[PDB]
């Protein structure tokens, strides 16, 4: 797939905003995540044993991995489509160690909609919702033909 330039502009005009509160931001998507798929919580063992909303908002850890992962994700969104490289060790990790099915990053993909489209409602109408899925569609298509590649194809 290919963005546009125009695509492009409405997904890095409301990441410039979710960049104003990252951790913030890394939190609610995270906690979203687990809420709504709570067979993803299992796969973190720093975690697992977080039992509630209210423990896992109070978990500093939890809050510094979401900065670590946004700001990853942040670093691939601004390559505009050419991010190779940004993608290599990420799909090394997520498929060798990790061991992330395709189906648990569709499931993070809509907790990141989600989370813009209640905080940001104002510059995240349809147009720019779909933009954001198709760039995190093409994420996921590339991730996927990585983990093929490495040998996971999970
Ligand atoms: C937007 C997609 C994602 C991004 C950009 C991302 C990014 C990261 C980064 C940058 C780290 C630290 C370095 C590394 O180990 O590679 C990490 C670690 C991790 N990731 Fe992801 N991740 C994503 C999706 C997920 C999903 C969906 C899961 C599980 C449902 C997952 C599970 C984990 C685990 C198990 C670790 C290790 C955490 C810890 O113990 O340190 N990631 N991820």
Known sequence: MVLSEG????????????????AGHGQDILIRLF????ET????DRFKHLKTEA???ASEDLKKHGVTVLT?????LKKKGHHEAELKPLAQSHATKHK??????????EAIIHVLHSRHPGNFGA???????????????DIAAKYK????QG
């Open 7 to 22: 695509e492009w502009q409405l997904v890095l005009h409301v990441w410039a905003k979710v960049e104003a509160d990252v």
């Open 35 to 38: 809420k709504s798929h709570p």
């Open 41 to 44: 919580l299992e796969k973190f």
């Open 55 to 57: 423990e896992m908002k």
């Open 72 to 76: 990853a994700l942040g670093a691939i």
């Open 100 to 109: 992330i099915p395709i189906k648990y990053l569709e499931f993070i993909s």
């Open 127 to 141: 147009d720019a919702q779909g933009a954001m899925n198709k760039a995190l569609e093409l994420f996921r298509k």
């Open 149 to 152: 590649e490495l040998g996971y």
